């Protein structure tokens, strides 16, 4: 017989849709900083980072779902009557042009994937393939990007998965509107190699493995005690 190990599998263990980032962007602003952005990383949410770092090399597709909700703000503008709000979620592949302004040329997205979503419909969804000149993402890198520089330890350009950019296509009304994107992340077709011990010490930095040393477990009163 034997009990089923179906949901213990790496696919079921890791292919779980979780929120990894949320940002708010305005509809009007002083500068062009009316856009949200997120460099796609797996080392910013502790639960997902621990689950992925239980293995050494992984290879998966990124399924991203965006939950965009808009809120009208304060007051002092009357007769708002805003039409429906359209959002653009532009994905910038590795090595692609990166916007610095809400109306940058990169938003014209000649080759950057972009999804335009009107509010009230189902949340937008896009899937990023395995994008790496290497053969697998490496959660751990015991080496230097440049051996000359000490600060390049553990950094390799093979784990860069691109950047997501979010903005308002139309303002709708002359009054303030702030939208939250709430990106939901879900690996698909996951293959993992070289399993590793779970991270014991709490994480400190996203780009580091540094740790304050911690006890192996919780203490008890006596070696023969039971409670």
């Amino acid at each position: 017989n034997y009990h089923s190990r179906s949901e213990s599998t790496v696919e079921n263990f890791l292919c779980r849709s979780a929120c990894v980032f949320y940002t708010t962007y305005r509809n009007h602003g002083t500068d062009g900083d009316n856009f949200g952005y997120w460099v796609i990383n797996t080392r910013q949410v502790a639960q997902l980072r621990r689950k992925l770092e239980m293995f050494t090399y992984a290879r998966f597709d990124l399924e991203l779902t965006f939950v965009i909700t808009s809120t009208q703000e304060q007051s002092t503008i009357q007769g708002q009557d805003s039409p429906v709000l359209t959002h653009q979620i532009m994905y910038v592949p590795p090595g692609g042009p990166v916007p610095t302004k809400v109306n940058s040329y990169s938003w014209q997205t000649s080759t950057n994937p972009s999804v335009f979503w009107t509010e009230g419909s189902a949340p937008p969804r896009m899937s990023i393939p395995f994008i790496s000149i290497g053969n697998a993402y490496s959660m751990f890198y015991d080496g230097w990007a440049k051996f000359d520089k000490q600060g390049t330890y553990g950094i390799n350009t093979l784990n860069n998965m691109g950047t997501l950019y979010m903005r308002h296509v139309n303002d709708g009304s002359p009054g303030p509107i702030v939208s939250t994107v709430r990106i939901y992340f879900k690996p698909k077709h996951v293959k993992t190699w070289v399993p590793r011990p779970p991270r014991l010490c709490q994480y400190q930095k996203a780009g580091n493995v540094n740790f304050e040393p911690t006890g192996v477990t919780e203490s008890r009163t006596d070696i023969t005690t039971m409670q």
Partner: protein, 234 residues
């Protein structure tokens, strides 16, 4: 043209759905897979691996490697207890942070047999006997050598073998039990004192290992109670 209905539950984002997602980078060729050694397809492969159990969990020792070393005294009362911990791989702090316990804390239900290995790290000329006694759940930990012997036990003779593998059976009323907080007890007893060529000074140690057997399973995935973040790390 083809008629279609509302079918309640549409235009919703159920987080735990398996719908196909449009590809943002179609017509892009991913690099072929490389034959990397160490393909793991199930977390039980991690859980099947022996991991050293910190039994010496006394205060002040969890920050040192002495937490893994069970001290075996050079002279002690016969029938004394060498150590003892409950069979709570996901609850008891002795087994909680092991590889098995780390896997278990990612789930809500579990079932299977716990495999315990005790290895004697004393001298090759050292000899002696131990009572590795197992108490079924609800019985209560034995208080003397005799109570341990009258139950399930093995006489682990140090001279004959330096290791003892003890397979803990599955005793519960349900197919699965909750990982969180009965389970049983392991207690070791000094059947005989450790005998050496009478010239040594320091004491021996016992190392413990925990593992899952082939009938081990976990049901309901959840968040581990060990890693915690206030916000995004960057």
């Amino acid at each position: 043209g083809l008629p279609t209905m509302l079918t309640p539950g549409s235009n919703q984002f159920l987080t735990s759905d398996d719908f196909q997602s449009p590809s943002a980078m179609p017509q892009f060729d991913v690099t072929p897979e490389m034959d990397i050694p160490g393909q793991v397809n199930n977390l039980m492969e991690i859980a099947e691996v022996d991991s050293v159990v910190p039994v010496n969990n006394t205060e002040g020792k969890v920050l040192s490697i002495e937490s893994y070393q069970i001290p075996v005294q050079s002279n002690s009362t016969n029938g004394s207890q060498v150590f003892g911990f409950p069979l709570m791989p996901g609850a008891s702090s002795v087994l909680n942070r092991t590889l098995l316990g780390e896997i278990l804390n990612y789930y809500t239900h579990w079932s299977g047999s716990i495999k315990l290995t005790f290895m004697f790290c004393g001298s090759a000329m050292a000899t002696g006997k131990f009572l590795l006694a197992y108490s079924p759940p609800g019985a209560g930990a034995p208080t003397t050598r005799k109570e341990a012997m009258l139950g399930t036990h093995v006489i682990w003779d140090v001279g004959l073998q330096s290791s003892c593998v003890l397979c803990i059976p599955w005793i519960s009323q349900t197919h699965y039990r909750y990982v969180v907080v009965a389970g049983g007890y392991i207690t070791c007893w000094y059947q005989t004192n450790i005998v050496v060529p009478a010239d040594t000074q320091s004491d021996c140690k016992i190392l413990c290992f925990v593992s899952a057997c082939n009938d081990f399973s976990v049901r309901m995935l959840k968040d581990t109670p060990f890693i915690k973040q206030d916000n995004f790390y960057q």
